Amino acid sequence: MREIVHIQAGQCGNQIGAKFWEVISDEHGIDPTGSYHGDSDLQLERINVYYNEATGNKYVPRAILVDLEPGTMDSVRSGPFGQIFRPDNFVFGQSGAGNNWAKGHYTEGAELVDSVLDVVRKESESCDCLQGFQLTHSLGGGTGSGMGTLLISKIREEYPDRIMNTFSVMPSPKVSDTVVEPYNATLSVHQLVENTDETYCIDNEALYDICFRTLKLTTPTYGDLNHLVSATMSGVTTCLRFPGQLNADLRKLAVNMVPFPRLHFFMPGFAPLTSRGSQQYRALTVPELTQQMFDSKNMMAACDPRHGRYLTVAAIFRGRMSMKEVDEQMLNVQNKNSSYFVEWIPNNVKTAVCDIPPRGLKMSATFIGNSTAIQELFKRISEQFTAMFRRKAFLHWYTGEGMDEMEFTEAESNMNDLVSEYQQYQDATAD
């Protein structure tokens, strides 16, 4: 287990993927030229997980960039680190999905997906030991969601034995006014229940609320939101990227975090919460990091963890800190908050420490929960879906592309089935 293959689709997927690549590149001492300029061997020891070694002592992100809309390819090449990516790994169409899932999943996205699989096979066959794939995309649009799930299915067919992992951005009416986003999100969640192993639930609703209530940004932009996303993505891939005694990979994470195949949607959390590009004038203590981590204000999914129970938890602390103090706080938080952990999965909280803090912080903590409280997110999507579907609002955008009401009914049934399972294990007793 070494090489990960990264795929970013659609506007949101390419935007947070770019940021992801800027952020870990600075952690690993790689500049926009792909040359290493760092000071620590630790930066390079597991660098092949995300980077191919190019001739010339350079490092090329093992990254494939996809969008039906051509414009976002030009935006990335312009952005910082636009010159790091392998030019042949840009796969662009000429017309977007028009925020229409069926266009990304059945029609336009289907006409471009073999072009994508060219690059995916080339990256996959080069790998000495392919961990699997991580995809960044949004569920509310038409490309990242529709073509993005179609891609997952197609990749799963040729690589059924590798781990399939997604960073999936959940729509919120606070951030976008596109009224069909509940449709696209419900259709996509259907696909992700059936076809991925691990999905990080990145909720625009949570991101907006954090920017507005905590960071006090009256009108947060996508750059405000994506600073939360990128901090999270850096933190939840830290153990994949840096050498520890844990020797983490995507499969060991799945095996321990997912007790039931469908219940594979993680609620990520982060501390400290910061604004982008802003000096931090005081560090956070280890008890501060531990407490503020399991606090609903720090969750990237708009869910109160105190409304549910954790099935499993994985936490990573970054910076130079007493691992003894970290062991103490983490054990205490579980003893004092005992009622928020299912009692029928013993020792269901795992903690790692990484001495290398992210840029701008002396210490930080990142949290990957499998909490039954995530049903709140799916109930919210479901309620919005139904409000529209009762009226058959906008269905002709979808049937004009060949779909059928039955597909909507099924994906709604399948998501309500997912809500019930969360509830079933939330009420389950050890006795």
């Binding site: 287990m1 844990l246 060991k252 095996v255 321990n256 007790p259 029928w344 013993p346 020792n347 795992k350």
Partner: protein, 428 residues
């Protein structure tokens, strides 16, 4: 003559093998190149034409990073490359991948190497297998290896050193599953398994060595000393020796009841500012603080006690020490065991890794006892297994690798029966 082949599986088994083979080289004066300035150590080291002494051991792991440290560490020339066997993917903490999916791709390599080591023996005594209960390789590949050893070598002795999982120093939430699974499939194939509880070793390193957060090298170095006490009888010219056959005969009253309890003494901080008597260290073996498995023998019954002394220990002093033990009412032996004591004495004192935490001592003792109290450790595992298995939590990862649910309840029933066996043998 009288050779023993050691097999070290997965991370835990390999890293402990490092502490053991380091200790053995230091006990016998072997340098990390295998050269050497009492011939009994030949049971554990073959010799090449150039006078190089190569351990009779295989190191196996499904992923290469742990064994790569051996390949580039201090003793990288102590082993032949062919003894250090690695694949490219570990079992991902999954028994089913260690035993089937991943493990089947390297099992034939391992038995070919073992077969080559058996061919360098004129009187093979048995195999020593070191593994964790909890790892996917530790459990699943060891089960496979044990089954294949039985086909290759019949009833030839097979003893385990097994690392029982502790939440304090753990890896995986599915470890109770892997533990029950490997114990089931392995039961019929092992003659004697010495279990080691990471929580007990952890607590000893805290209380007796004043180490706040003990690391694996702390745990492993203590674990190496216990292992060495056991094998010292087979590696040295001693007064009272105990061979592999004698361990099994004296400690295992019933095929399934083959999980003796280890206890070691003294465990002294190397930075402590009086040499303990033969009696003091003998009494320490019956205190629960020095047990390698957390359980309460005073609330169980002993079925056999094997006392392995090393260093400056005279037989009159053992006899006086043991006679005191035979008068403690808190030490209860079963009715069907008229005589339960076996004693061995090797005279070379214990050896300590310089720059380690354990102090050099003029005499030490390791007790191996078969007590019904070990069942308490089996009950602790079964309960964690039952908590998750009632909801079929994580079982899908094992079914996905081709296992069937029936293997889980059939393994849990075998541990039920095992628990009921420890009850039955303790009646009068």
């Amino acid at each position: 003559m009288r050779e023993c082949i050691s097999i070290h599986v997965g991370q835990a088994g390999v890293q402990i093998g490092n502490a053991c083979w380091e200790l053995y080289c230091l006990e016998h004066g072997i340098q990390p190149d295998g050269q050497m300035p009492d011939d009994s150590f030949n049971t554990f080291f073959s010799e090449t034409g150039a006078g190089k002494h190569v351990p009779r051991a295989v190191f196996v792991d499904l992923e290469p990073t742990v064994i790569d440290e051996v390949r580039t560490g201090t003793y990288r020339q102590l082993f032949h490359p062919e003894q250090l066997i690695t694949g490219k993917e570990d079992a991902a903490n999954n028994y089913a991948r260690g035993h089937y999916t991943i493990g089947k791709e390297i099992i034939d390599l391992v038995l070919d190497r073992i077969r080559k080591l058996a061919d360098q023996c004129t009187g093979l005594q048995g195999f020593l297998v070191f593994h964790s209960f909890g790892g996917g390789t530790g459990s699943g590949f060891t089960s496979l290896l044990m089954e294949r050893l039985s086909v290759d070598y019949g009833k030839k002795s097979k003893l385990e050193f097994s690392i029982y999982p502790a939440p304090q120093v753990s890896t995986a939430v599915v470890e109770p599953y892997n533990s029950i699974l490997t114990t089931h499939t392995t039961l019929e194939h092992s003659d004697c398994a010495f279990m080691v509880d990471n929580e007990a070793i952890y607590d000893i390193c805290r209380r007796n060595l004043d180490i706040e957060r003990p690391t694996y090298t702390n745990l492993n170095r203590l674990i190496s000393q216990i292992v060495s006490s056991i094998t010292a009888s087979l590696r040295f010219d001693g007064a009272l020796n105990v061979d592999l056959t004698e361990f099994q005969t004296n400690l295992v009253p019933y095929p399934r009841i083959h999980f003796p309890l280890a206890t070691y003494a003294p465990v002294i901080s190397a930075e402590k500012a009086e040499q303990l008597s033969v009696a003091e260290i003998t009494n320490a073996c019956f205190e629960p603080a020095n047990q390698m498995v957390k359980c309460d023998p005073r609330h169980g019954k002993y079925m056999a006690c094997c006392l392995l002394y090393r260093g400056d220990v005279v037989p009159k002093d053992v006899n006086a020490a043991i006679a005191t033990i035979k008068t403690k009412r808190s030490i209860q032996f079963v009715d069907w065991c008229p005589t339960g004591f076996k004693v061995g004495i090797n005279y070379q004192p214990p050896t300590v890794v310089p720059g380690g935490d354990l102090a050099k001592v003029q005499r030490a003792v390791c007790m191996l006892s078969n007590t019904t109290a070990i069942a308490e450790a089996w009950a602790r595992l079964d309960h964690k297994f039952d908590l998750m298995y009632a909801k079929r939590a994580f079982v899908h990862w094992y079914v996905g690798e081709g296992m069937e649910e029936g293997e889980f309840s059939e393994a849990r029933e075998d541990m039920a029966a095992l628990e009921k066996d420890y009850e039955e043998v303790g009646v009068d």
